[PDB]
Structures are given as C-alpha cells and as structure tokens.
Amino acid sequence: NTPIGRDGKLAKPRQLHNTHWGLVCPAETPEGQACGLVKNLSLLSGISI
Amino acid sequence: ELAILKEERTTTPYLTKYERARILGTRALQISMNAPVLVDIEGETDPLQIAMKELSQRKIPLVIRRYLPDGSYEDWGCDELIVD
Amino acid sequence: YVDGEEEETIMIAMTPEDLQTRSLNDTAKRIKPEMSTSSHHTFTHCEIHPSMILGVAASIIPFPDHNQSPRNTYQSAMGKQAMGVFLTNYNVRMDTMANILYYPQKPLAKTQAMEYLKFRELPAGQNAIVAIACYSGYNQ
Amino acid sequence: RHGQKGTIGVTYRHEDMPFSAEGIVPDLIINPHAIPSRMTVAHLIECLLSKVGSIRGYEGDATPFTDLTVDAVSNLLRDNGYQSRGFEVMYNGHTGKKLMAQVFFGPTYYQRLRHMVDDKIHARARGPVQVLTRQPVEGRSRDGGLR
Amino acid sequence: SALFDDIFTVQTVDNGRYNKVSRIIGISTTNSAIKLTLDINNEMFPVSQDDSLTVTLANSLSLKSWRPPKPTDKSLADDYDYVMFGTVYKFEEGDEDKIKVYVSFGGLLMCLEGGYKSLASLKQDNLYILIRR
Amino acid sequence: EPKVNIINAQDDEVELMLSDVNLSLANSLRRTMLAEVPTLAIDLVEIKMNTSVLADEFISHRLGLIPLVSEDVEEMKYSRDCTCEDYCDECSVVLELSARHEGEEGTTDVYSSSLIKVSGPGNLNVGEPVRRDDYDQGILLCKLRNHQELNIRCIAKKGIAKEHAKWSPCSAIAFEYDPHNKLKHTDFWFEVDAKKEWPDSKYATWEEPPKPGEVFDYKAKPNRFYMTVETTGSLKANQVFSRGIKTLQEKLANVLFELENSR
Amino acid sequence: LMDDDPVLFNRQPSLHKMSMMAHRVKVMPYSTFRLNLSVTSPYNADFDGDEMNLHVPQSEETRAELSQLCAVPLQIVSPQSNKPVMGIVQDTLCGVRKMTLRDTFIEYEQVMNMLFWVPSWDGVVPQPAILKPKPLWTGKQLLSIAIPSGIHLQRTDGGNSLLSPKDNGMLIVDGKVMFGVVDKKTVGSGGGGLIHTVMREKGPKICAELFGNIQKVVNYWLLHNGFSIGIGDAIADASTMKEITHAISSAKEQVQEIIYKAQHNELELKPGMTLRESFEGEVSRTLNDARDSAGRSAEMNLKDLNNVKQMVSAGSKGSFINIAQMSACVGQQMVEGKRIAFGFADRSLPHFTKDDFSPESKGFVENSYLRGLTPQEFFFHAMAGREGLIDTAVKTAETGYIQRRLVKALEDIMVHYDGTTRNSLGDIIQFLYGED
Amino acid sequence: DPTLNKTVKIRQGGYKGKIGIVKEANGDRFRVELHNPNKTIPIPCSFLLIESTHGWVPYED
Amino acid sequence: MIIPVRCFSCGKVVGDKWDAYLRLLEEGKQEGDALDELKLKRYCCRRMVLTHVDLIEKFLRYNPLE
Amino acid sequence: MNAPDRFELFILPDDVPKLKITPDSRVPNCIIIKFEREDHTLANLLREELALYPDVTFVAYKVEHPLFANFVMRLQTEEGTRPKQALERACASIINKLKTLDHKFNEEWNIKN
Amino acid sequence: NLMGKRVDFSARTVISGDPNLELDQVGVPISIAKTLSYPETVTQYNIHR
Amino acid sequence: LETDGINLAEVMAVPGVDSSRTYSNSFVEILSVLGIEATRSSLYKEILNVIAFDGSYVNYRHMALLVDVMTSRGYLMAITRHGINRADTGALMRCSF
RNA sequence: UGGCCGUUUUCGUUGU
Ligand SMILES: [Mg+2]
Ligand SMILES: [Zn+2]
Ligand SMILES: [Zn+2]
C-alpha cells in the first residue's frame, strides 16, 4: 500500500519505475482510484528484519 | 394587449414537433377519459391511435397559445396549422 | 541477497548462457539484445530465472511474454473473482459467502511456477473446447 | 486467462452447434473480432499447446523466457496428424452443409466469474421510502430505487 | 430479336486477386475498334487466352417473379453456354464514335466500345448477354 | 433408392456409409437421433437421509447422468400422459440405493452396480443400469468413510434428450462427405498450398482424388455420407438408428394427419 | 407491461443525448435485457458485463411524448456532427464485406431462404446474374433487395474508373447495388454513407427498418458461410522475416551512427531544441519509421485469404498497427513522450553497462509478439501499459467535470418563437440560432 | 381456510409427482411452491395430492 | 472433485474408467498410452482423465461430524 | 429465474393447433405456414424435398428466434397444384424413403453379424 | 434529492446481443413486466381486455 | 515568424510586419488590444483547433453558441463558479451549480 | 376483519 492518498491525482507516485526490477510485480494492480498504488512483491521478494 | 390580432400573426404556420406531441398526448388523454371523438374508429382502439388519425384529418378542437418572449401571446388553431 | 540500493552498482547476466559469449537466424523466435556498447564484459552476478520477476497472480498466465501488458494486468485483476476450491475444509468452515465449482480441473498449459502455487492441486477453472468463429451472430 | 472476458448471450442444444470431422462439438463459441484488436497472441498459443497436450496426453511447459516457439508446437501437432496451425474443418449443424471457412478449434483454460446475473436483476413498483424525505430507499436488497 | 451480335477474340485473360472470376479483354473480329472488356466466372464457364467467342445482346428471351426454368419452355439461350442477366448503369454518348455502354451483372461489370451504328440500340435498362460454346 | 453399407458394426459404435439421400435427410436423422430418441433416466431423487461430504443436489445430479437400460422404453407411456394418480409401475421404474461403510479404516466406493431395481413394468427390460461387463464395477457415484451412510429412493421417467442431456442415447456422431472436397464446399486455408499442409481424412481411400485435369461439375451434389455412430450403452446402435427413423416417420405422419384433418 | 408499449432506457454515464432513448417492449424469458447489436454505439456499450437502467411512463400524455420525441428512429443522425450515429458493426459489417465481394455466388435454395428473411420483402424473386447453365446470384443483388425503392448514391475511391478493376467505389441506382465492396465507408456511421441517404430520403421509419433487414440477411449468410480466425493469421513467410530483420538492422545501424556523430559534436542542432532533445527526437523518428517500414512489408506480404487482413479491410475491428505489432515488431516504447529513463545509475536496467543509448538499451522492443519479448523488453512494455492505464484513469474524471460545468452554464438557453436565442432573463445571445 | 402451509404433490400435469408447498391460496387456483426447482407455479385444486394422517389424500382434506 | 459422469463436450461416459486409469499409471505406463488402452481417442475426453484432480479423498480426510 | 420450461420445447398447449396455415395474398398460389414446436430438424427436411418437386415455385422457412419453438414456412406451388397437396406429397415421399432406408439397414445389420 | 432523486417504476439488469430483434425493441425479462405496471383508464374499447 | 512570448500591441508597430493580420494564441490579449469581436473570433478558432487536431469534427453552430454565450455581456465570462454565479440571473440557478 | 412496521454513519472492497 501507499499512504499518498488521492487528493491531487499526479502521476509520479502511481507510475512504475526501473528500480522495481525483480521486487514487485510489473503485471498486478487494481483498477480505478487505486490503480498503480497497491503493489505486490515479486516471487522472490524478501523483507529485511 | 398580450393577444395579437389574427391579421398580424407572425409566428410560423407549420406545427412544431413539440406542439404535435403535446396536442397528441392531450387529445389522447381526453379521448381516453370519455371525450368525444371527432373522426371514425374502425379498428384502432388505442386512444393515441385515434388522436393520430384525428390529427391527420385536421379535426382536433384545440388552440395553441404561443407566448412571445416579451409576454404577449397569439392564438393559432390546430385547424389552420399546416401539419407536415 | 541484494536490494535496490545495492543493485545500484552491479552488472548482471540475464541468464547463465550470457556468462559465456555466444557465436542460426531463425525466423520464428525471439532475438537477444545486441549488447555491443561494451566490447569487454566482466560479470559479477547472474539472474536465477527471469520469470521470477512476476507476481503470484501473474505467474498463472501462460506465455506472459506474448501479450500486451494491459491484458496481463486485466487477467491478474479478475483472477481473484474466479470460482473454484479455495480450501479443502469448506464443509466445516461456515462463512458468509463461499462458492465451489463442481469439477475443477488443472490447466492443460501450466507455467512451471504453478508447482509451488499449488494451482494444479487447487485449480479454479476448466479446460473447455471453444470454437473461435462467428456462428449465428449472437456471440458479438 | 488472457483478459478475453465475456458473458453468455444464448445457449444451443448439442445438435444445432457445429461439429468437426471427428464428431466433436465445441463447449463455447467466442467472437473472432475480439482477438486482433487486443493482440492476445498468448491466447492462440495456449489453445495450440492445449490441443497438443490433450492429443499427446501431457501438459505443456509455457514458462516465459524459454526456447519454446510456435514452430515446435506446429511440428508436433502435424506429426500427430493435424493441421500444423490448429485449424479444423467444421460443419454446420442446422444442415450439415460444410462451412466455407476453417474454424480454429481447441481446449482453452477458462474460469467462471463471480458476477452471476441474478445478483443484479432488480425491479421497483413501490416500497419503502426514506422517512426524512418521503423518497424511495437506496439499494437492491432493500427494494431501493435507482438514481 | 437480337439487338447485337459479333464474334470476339480473347486477347488477354487475367485472374489477379480473384479465383472464381477473371477479367478478359476481347476485340471483335468483324469490326476492329470494338473493344470488349468483361469479367467471367472461371468455374462456371472456363476460358483461356486466344479464344474466340460469339456474343449476343438481346433485350429479352421470349421467342415478373422468376421461376426455375421448365424444360418445356424454349428461349434464345438454348444454343449458348453462358448467360448473364444485367442492367445498364450508364449509356455513354462518348466521342465522335467512341460510344461506350455500361452493363452490370450484379457485380460483374462490362465495358464495351463500338461504333454508334453498332451500339445504337443498346440504350436500354436490362440486357442479357449470351456466349456460344 | 436409398442405400446402406455398414463398414464396422459393434454393440455401441456403428461405422457405416449412407449414400443416395438428400444431405438434408442425413443431417436431420443425425439431429433427431441425437435429440428425439425417447429413453429412461433418473428423474426424481428422494433422499431419505445422507451423511456424505457431497451435497444432496450433487448426488441427485450425478444420478441424473446414470444410463438406464431402456430397450423396452418404447412401451412405457409418458408420465405426463399416464392417467394414474401419482406415478404407477406402468409409467415409472423405481430404483433404490442404500449403501454404507463401517469401520474406522479404509474407504468404501459406492458404484453404479450397487443400484437396485425395486419395481418396473416387467418384464420389460427397463430400469437396469448398464455395464460394460459383469465384473466391471462401473460408474463411481461417491466415496464413504467411517459411519457415513447413503440412502436414496430414485425414480426414472420417459423424457427426451431435448428436455435434458441425460436422455441423450447418442454420445458422439461423426459425419462427413466428399473427403477430397470435389464439391469444393470448403475453401482451404494455407500458407504455401492446400495439399501439402492439410492431412487427409481416414476415408481418403473411399473416393478417388479428382484428376488434375478434372474440371468443376456445377450439377454435382453431396451423395455419400460416412456417419460413425456411438452410444453410451443405454441402447444398441442398431436400435438407435431404427428408433430414430421410426420417430421421424411418426412425426411426419402426425404432420400429415394435421394437414388432412385441418380441412 | 405488454408488448409494443413505450418505455425509457438509459446507461451511465449519459454523456450525450444519444445515451437515452424510448424503445418498445417485447416480453421474453430469461433475466437479461437485449439490444439490437447496432444500437450499442450510441450507448457506447458492450456485452462484456455492462448494465442498463429502465423507466416506464405512468400516464398517457407521457406515453405520447415518449413516442413522438424519443423513439430510436428519430435519433439516427446526430446533431453533434450532422451525421448518422448508429451503424453496422462487428459481425454484420465484417460479413457483408465478404458477401459483397465480386466472386461470391449463392445457389437457389439458400436464396429462397434469405429472400424470405427480409420482413419487408416484396415477395417477388429477382432474376439471377446467371440463367445458364446454373441459376446463380451474387451477394450484391441480395444486399440490394434490402435497400428500399427510390434510392440513389455514388462515390469515387482512389479515382477509380467506372470499370473499377480494384472493385472499390460505390454506385447504387434506384436502391440496387450496381457494384462495389460494401463496407464501413458505405454503411458505417460516417457521413455520406448509405444510412445517411436512406434517413434523409425515406424518413426515419424506413431507416430503422433498414438496419434490421441488413442485419438479418448478412447474419444469415454468414451463418451458412461462417468466419473464424487462427494463429496462422499472425505468421508470414520466412522471406518477409528476412526483409524485416534486415530493415531492423539498418535502422539500428542508422541510430548507431547518429549516436556516433552526436558524441562528437558534429550533429546539426535543430532550431528551438537543444543537443539532447534534438538527438532524441531524431532517434525516435528513425525508430518509428523503421517500425512502420517493417510493418508495411509484413502487411504487403499478407494474402487476401488471411483473416486478419479480411477484418482490417472490412474495418469492423483492428488497424494496421495491430498487424505490424503482432507480426513485424512491437517497436519503441514511449513514456511521457521520452524514451526509457536511466532510473538506475547511468542506465535503464542494471544488466547493461553504464551509458548505453542504443534502441534496446532505452526501450526498443525488437521482436514481435509472435516471437515473444525478451525480459527487459517485457518490463519496458509493462511500463508503457501502466502509463496508459494511469492516463485513462485520470482523464475520465476531468472530462466528466468539464462536461458538468458546461452543461450547467448553458442549461437555460432556449429558442423562442421570434427566432432569437435567449437565456431565462430575456438576454439575446443569437438573434437567429447559429446564424441560419 | 384451514388448507394452507401443507406439503402437496402433483398427480396430473407436466410436473406429475413433485413435492410442493402451498404458499398462497387466494381461491379456486392454488399457488403451490415446489422443491426441485426454485419457482412457484399456479395449479387447479383438483390436480394435487394432499398429505393426510395416512397416505396421500386428494383434494378432500 | 470427483471424476465426472459424462464428458461435457461429447457425452462419452468416462467416470467409470478413472480407477483403471490410475491402475495403468501405477506400473509406469506413459499417460498417452494409458489413455489409449482405455480407448479414448477424441481428445475431448482425453482432456478430463489427463487433467482431473481428485479432491474427494481430501474432503473425506476430515472426520465427519458423525 | 425466467427460463422457459424445457418440457415445453416439444409439448403443445391445447388451445394452439400443431400447425397453422396462412395464405399469402400478395402473390398467386402462395401460402405461409405457422408451425408449432418444430425447428430445423423438421423444417430443413421438408424444405429440401418440397424444393426438389417440379410443381413448386417458391418454398422457404425461417426460425424466428432459437428461444422460441416454432417456425414459419413459405410455400408457393404453381397453379397446377395447390400447396397443401404438394406438402403432403413430399411428406409421403420422405415417409417412404425413410421406410426403405430402415428396411435396408435392418437387412444389412442382420447379414453383417 | 432535488436535481436528482431515486425514482419509481424502474428496473436494472445486464444487456446481451440480439441480432433478431428490431431496432426500436428490447428484450424485457418476464419478471419485470410482471412487477412494473401502468395505470389504464376504463373505456368501452378495452373493457373486455 | 512564430514566437514564444506574447506581446500583441507592441509587435504590430514593428516595421516589416503586416499589422492587419498578426494573431496571438492568448485571446486575453485579443480582448485587451483588438477589442471584443476579434476576441470572439480568436476564441472560436482556438476551440476549433483544439477539438479538430486529433481529426474530429463538430457542427459549427454549437461552438458558435458556446463562444457567443461566453462573451454575451462583453467580457470573458470564464466558465466557473465565479463567472456563472456573478451573473445576475435567478438565485436558484447559480446556487445549484 | 379489514388495516399493516425494519437504522444510520462510517470505511472498505469491487463492478461498468
Ligand atoms: Mg467493458
Ligand atoms: Zn402411471
Ligand atoms: Zn468427450
């Protein structure tokens, strides 16, 4: 999730980025207002503890 | 005063679609609530159909009162209006 | 392990093959990038398998490298509204809304990754014989 | 599995539908128009590989970024005795007269969706009205009226 | 009852795109400058280059709903191997003597050139075209 | 005028050759025997009690598909028309199943064979479930485990494949003609040429390929239909064919009766 | 409710007044509404799950008004662009295209059927285009049977002659097709099409009937002929692949040399743009041009039997770029008008070395979908698709807002009898609406 | 009317022998709801079977 | 869940053959073979027995409420 | 929830006769038949033969909508024969053709095994 | 609730193709036609109906 | 000559330039310098260019009505809450928007 | 013996 809200559309937060290579799914995201916000970790992602 | 004499009437003599619809609905209602029919009925039991036919024969006793922008009005007869 | 920041300064080989320079000219297969801007290469890491970059709802799609990406995204979207068998013990669980397909069947065309997603063990769709043809004009 | 979403317009008994040379009939019929505009090549490749797997009796490997190409699938399908591109002559059902075109025909993985029709059907003649406004309530479940 | 007649040679045959239908450019034998361009169905009446043909253009066939042809009735066509009913969509009053007549057989068009004396009587609505053998 | 030439006969599958009949007729025969062959199948499933992990509707459905020997169904009247109050043994064949498992280990497997005929308008050979063999257990209806009991009181009736696909006696009708496309009714897609891509039909040797110089026949028609029938076993393929022909005949006869009676 | 009664009908959003109409009732089973496949465009609807709403008059005057004012026939031509709004779409269109090809022939019994399907048919068969040796009809005759009496038209495409060897161009006389491949350009919603003329000439009622008649006929013929698509439609001969591959190599070489020059401060500076911007614009033009060239090569390769080409020509779906991308090359992937940024340190993806400007290195998808993309190119394609999605999502709401504001602004302006256009107060904005 | 909310079958008609429940009994045309389908059908009073103390009793209960 | 009764496409009853298919698989015969010996030629049937998933054993693995 | 009865696709209501004829007054010796509970299975067969006859000018039918079980047949025989006779003649012809086919198949199956 | 409001005598549903219907006609499930209704004054022309 | 930057009054007096045709893309300066009617025409031209750039087309009368309402009072009645509400029409009207 | 009463407000998820 992203705590950027929706008051003011903009496009930098929603769009994809190069660094995402191999960490989030380039294919999955919902449709409508959340499109681009809600992401999903890639199939080999790992979170530092 | 607000009326204008039939000698000097200036509005178009064709019957506009809105006038057609309003007269048809009004007559069909009246027809459908025990009003007399000014033309023959043979098979068209539908009051709207009766109204359509009666208009086609120019046998409808209704006067349009068109309001000019100022507030004056003029009186056209459904009889005289040229139905296309 | 490596993160985005650490990735910032590492050169990777797309596959183990690239680790050795290659030497043909098929008319019906993909072509590798030219990669000619650095006549000398000194690799330091090699990807496990490129297909790993996808997500869970995305690995269900067969041949995702053969589609217009928005279609991939759409398919990912409805993948979560597909009737099927969510959990073996549906009988004992007693929830508000739950649906079960009588005769689920695994997809004839699997992606290798679906082994670990158990999809072939819990499918949510059938293999149906469909004819792509204007038959009587009701399918427009 | 490729976004070619759609509904069911009408259903046909077994006889009226077209059948191939072997007596098969298809489960479902979709619109060709939908494919070219959307460029869902994976859909066609999946249908081909599914046909190959069914005849050869095993599941196909469709992992992206591999050496598989439509060439190999065509070769296998031909060797197994079918058109190397998956076309199959079909016959009309209302008469049996052949179909001047050659239909594409095979098993594809579908999956039903949650939006059954009856969940959305609705009507309203008269019913509950908001006390505050003397206006009909909102929502299908409560006999609501549309805006 | 025939409004015209001549014998035509087949100069060139072209198929191009189509398969069941092909275009032929023919020139008359009796009178040059009568150039014929017609489109015919290969399967329904095959031909080839360098052929010769007998062409007729008769207003009617008697010697409105159609019916399958009874074998009892007789018609002018009985002695020809390809018939096409048509209509004239343009009757050109062309140059000094380059008069052109345009007939469409429901998609198959026919452009004809010839002397006004030759085409004077083809100013009509619907025309049959008959080809011998 | 009509001819017949059976190529391979059997209990279930018939692979024949029908020629010298209007293609309309062959197609209509195929349709009618796919759709309009009266048969017998489970209709009303009355469940006294159940303890399986399968929904009651799920079993009632599974029973709906069980093929019933209907070799004498032609004698059985329509339950819609029969005058008896409720059902009778002359308009309904009652079958009951009551199976159970006991013990804490293993899994029982209730098969179609466990079905039993209680009554039926005997000795009409109707009601019995079909089997490939005697020892062939057959169709699998469910699996039972410790303490799980299944009891049902089935009913069958005489309906037609129109009203549902359980009344279909036909499984898969092959059908074709002109294996070399002499009549050309199909245009062949290709990338290089029609002949070096499309593999030949199995009836390839049954009609000689057109000669290279052969030219089109505009009076040609479809003449030889090769239709290979198959059945689930609920009725013998020959019975299927004869019954379809009889049904179509009586239907046309009804139509002609209507025509004459109208005046 | 009984059949033939009048009731409203609607979709949301109701952008333009062609999103509401007054239809007639037909009672039927099942629990869905059904629309003639033509009227989808005015509702901008499709059956991928869309929904509609309904309303019913409760009085006769209202029934009269609905009948006389909001019936579908009167809505056929759009006062927005003075042209027909509905049109023959999808199967009917893509079919009637083939039915009217010159070399399609129909035997007698099929014609017996089709001529009876046309409800308004006169009941008098037309004589065939062949009376010997075999009575045959051409589709054009039948399609014409649909068109009512007293109809005229004409059109010249590509400057063809009145002979039309290309078989383009359209000439109708008394409502009988004289020749021409009937398709969108003739029956589409566009201006000057058959529908426009039928409307203007015979009134609305006949124009409505025309859609149903043509639909029935072409649907029936397609049924008894049928149409489909298959994977082979997306493949071409190896020679065309060699051509396109060498074209791609040439384009890549051109970009290589362009970079070599721009490196050396020898590349001319475009006025109004800097070195980098002009450099990018030039390379983008080069790559787009190479893609278009390869696409045109693959297109000219296609045979007329190929279904994709049949649809494209018919035009009921698809376009040239679709073919170019499926078969020839996806091409270049563009983001906010610029190539793929160097999100990493001096490169797009960590796999390439630093400072690579070559097409693939900044988002040139070399292969076509049929060949399948390589990983990096797949990722770039994903970026592009996400961008398009975001753009649509943003644009829809803003357009809705602007439309709302406008509608509120002008909501009161109406046309009085005097011929002057006044708002509520009586201000006069135009003395004669639109000046005519 | 004491003849409501009782299990009822159909002895004659296109649904011969289907268990149904009397949902509405306005008059002379009983509205009965079945079990196998998800629907309710009208039916004349004399075309039904009414459960009684013993056996199935026609319209005399 | 359980092997269906009738093939959806054609109608050729298959459910009874499931056990035999498992049996043939046991001794290591390749799947295409096993499907052959059952006399399943039309792949409209081959699709099922090749790609049906048995769940009823899983659903029974839970002790019934009885 | 509004699906038709699947037993109604073939069963006929009492008040509606199985077949209904309508003379086609706009041309001579033409009739239009309003069938009931029938589809391509019967219509195609009747039409093929009635077309094969010599004294039939026009014959055709159409399936209004697959959601309804009835179709309409147009028939127009020459003045020589009234259409009713032509239709019943075709009926008899198919009846006898089917009988012949049945007999031949019976004999063939007897000999085959 | 003034510019717009929830209204009566309405109905909503899915839509589907129908090549065999007129242009100005629309499939209307039976249940809705049974639900909605339209007042009809009593005249001599419809008393029986 | 095309330029970036708008100065309408000053440039027309620059020698070497046709001062009877020069046009600017900011119709506000059109109102400021070349009066109102020129403003109307420039506004219409700009709207037409914007809509038609893609390839679309709209009946002229509609855009004419839009512009001629926009400048009926003589000054740019920019379509927002301000301009619409600043109109002296009935309160019920301007309130709802 | 007619006559006859089922929340709001949030937030979420989705759908076109
Ligand atoms: Mg949609
Ligand atoms: Zn009985
Ligand atoms: Zn099967």
PDB file of C-alpha atoms in Angstrom, chain F residues 189-191 218-220, chain G residues 133-134 232-233 303 305:
ATOM      1  CA  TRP F 189      -6.652 -22.027 -45.776  1.00  0.00           C
ATOM      2  CA  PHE F 190      -2.915 -22.440 -46.254  1.00  0.00           C
ATOM      3  CA  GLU F 191       0.490 -20.774 -46.219  1.00  0.00           C
ATOM      4  CA  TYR F 218     -21.793 -27.461 -61.398  1.00  0.00           C
ATOM      5  CA  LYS F 219     -24.586 -30.035 -61.142  1.00  0.00           C
ATOM      6  CA  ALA F 220     -22.677 -32.128 -58.589  1.00  0.00           C
TER       7      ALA F 220
ATOM      8  CA  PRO G 133     -26.003 -23.245 -67.072  1.00  0.00           C
ATOM      9  CA  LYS G 134     -26.863 -22.854 -63.371  1.00  0.00           C
ATOM     10  CA  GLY G 232      -1.579 -18.810 -38.834  1.00  0.00           C
ATOM     11  CA  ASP G 233      -3.127 -15.413 -39.483  1.00  0.00           C
ATOM     12  CA  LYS G 303      -2.589 -12.840 -48.665  1.00  0.00           C
ATOM     13  CA  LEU G 305      -7.153 -15.279 -47.505  1.00  0.00           C
TER      14      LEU G 305
END
